């Protein structure tokens, strides 16, 4: 007879299509709320600096919790402690990059690798452009380019990370599931820096490129990305 | 049905409409526009009546066949491409043809033809160049314009009119169109002093003369 089978599979296809449309409205309004959150986070530090200055006092800002680390020195001739920490930072090739949250263990891990990396505090434009341009995902331990939101939602949906905006939000505002979102992100494969490094072997304080550039990593991401 | 309207979004940049989805809901007024709910011919034969089957089965099969391509989207054919001009080419400017048998010669530009090519006459009384097509890229456009806003080219000349047929013979309508457009162009360039000699001369690069240093 089939006149009920066709109408049932039409209703089922329409049901999952309306489900997908509701999910798209969900991630739209989540991205709007994220934009409002970033406005508040950017103006709040300025407003508190202003009230401290007009009160005469100072305002030590929040010491940053999110760094981006880039391996600038190659495979050859590495101390074994250093190559072990570079493996735990997942910086294997030269000019790889990873996000890293900061605490007492991780700061000393970055210190024990310091001549081989350039690591800094990335801003929201840096996190955006690294995710959209070079950001891939370790799906089934393969390397699938994040071309759709379903590739993120199938792996990280149980952490309420269902779109790339949620991914960017947790990376920038380091959340509870930063470990899982970060470990989902593959190590970034950046190109060699256009314009070029000033000096690879010496520290940034002494006019080189290694070590803790603080927020001058947002000049170097723009030209390695 | 109804009469089709034009786009209620004014286009802001390409791919972005100036009005959001709620504002365009309001402008379309969709609050009040809801809705809810071949192969055989029979021919007489003087027998009986035969059922002729159009689109018959194929007679032959090639011993192996290629498969069907995947479907891509943005790859239009040439006839419906969008056509761009440079800003330094406006109807009335003088051109320096750089490639063909009419190379080097200075030429009045008429209009943009429908197939990307430029319509051309540096008038045949001056430098022996007819109503000819040319390519935009293969032409230096100098900064010398004439005000041809009130000339009437015949509308019956297109790419289909200048397209090659198959020795070559000049037809009569070529000569008639040539004189009909030269009678409008040539008194308008005799108004500008020393311009007919400029169109009779040719372009050349001599010693010490470099195009990147020279403006034109």
């Amino acid at each position: 007879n089939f006149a009920e089978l066709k109408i049932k599979r039409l209703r089922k296809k329409f049901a999952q299509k309306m489900l997908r449309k509701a999910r798209r409205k969900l991630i739209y309004e989540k991205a709007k709320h994220y934009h409002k959150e970033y406005r508040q986070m950017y103006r709040t530090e300025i407003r508190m600096a202003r009230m401290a200055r007009k009160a005469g006092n100072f305002y030590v800002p929040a010491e940053p919790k999110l760094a981006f680390v880039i391996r600038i020195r190659g495979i050859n001739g590495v101390s074994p402690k250093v190559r072990k920490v570079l493996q735990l930072l997942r910086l294997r090739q030269i000019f790889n990059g990873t996000f890293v949250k900061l605490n007492k263990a991780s700061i000393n891990m970055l210190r024990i690798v310091e001549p081989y990396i350039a690591w800094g505090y990335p801003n929201l434009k840096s996190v955006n452009e690294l995710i959209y341009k070079r950001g891939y995902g370790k799906i089934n331990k393969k390397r699938i380019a994040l071309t759709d939101n379903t590739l993120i939602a199938r792996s990280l949906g149980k952490y309420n990370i269902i779109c790339m905006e949620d991914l960017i939000h947790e990376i920038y505002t380091v959340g509870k599931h930063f470990k899982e979102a970060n470990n989902f992100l593959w190590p970034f494969k950046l190109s060699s820096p256009r314009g070029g490094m000033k000096k690879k072997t010496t520290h940034f304080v002494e006019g080189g490129d290694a070590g803790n550039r603080e927020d001058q990593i947002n000049r170097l991401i723009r030209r390695m990305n | 049905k109804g009469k089709p309207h034009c786009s209620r979004n004014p286009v802001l940049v390409r791919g972005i409409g100036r009005y959001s989805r709620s504002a365009m809901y309001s402008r379309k007024a969709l609050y009040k526009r809801k809705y809810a709910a071949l192969a055989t011919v029979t021919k007489p034969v003087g027998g009986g009546t035969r059922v002729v089957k159009l689109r018959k089965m194929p007679r032959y099969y090639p011993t192996e066949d290629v498969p069907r391509k995947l479907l891509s989207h943005g790859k239009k054919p040439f006839s419906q491409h969008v056509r761009k001009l440079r800003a330094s080419i406006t109807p009335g400017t003088i051109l320096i043809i750089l490639t063909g048998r009419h190379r080097g010669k200075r030429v009045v530009f008429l209009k943009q033809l429908s197939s990307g090519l430029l319509l051309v006459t540096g008038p045949l009384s001056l430098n022996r160049v007819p109503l000819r097509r040319t390519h935009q890229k293969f032409v230096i456009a100098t900064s010398t314009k004439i005000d041809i806003s009130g000339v009437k080219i015949p509308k019956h000349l297109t790419d289909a009119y200048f397209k090659k047929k198959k020795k070559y013979e000049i037809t009569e309508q070529r000569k008639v169109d040539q004189k009909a457009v030269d009678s409008q162009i040539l008194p308008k360039i005799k108004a500008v002093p020393q311009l007919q000699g400029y169109l009779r001369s040719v372009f050349a690069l001599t010693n010490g003369v470099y195009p990147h240093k020279l403006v034109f």
Binding site: F14, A15, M18, L19, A22, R23, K25, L26 | K34, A36
Partner: peptide, 19 residues
């Protein structure tokens, strides 16, 4: 609304509300 099991009747109701 946008997750399947608990938002099923809500998606059904907005589907009827489209008509």
């Amino acid at each position: 609304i946008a997750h399947p099991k608990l938002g099923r009747r809500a998606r059904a109701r907005i589907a009827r509300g489209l008509r």
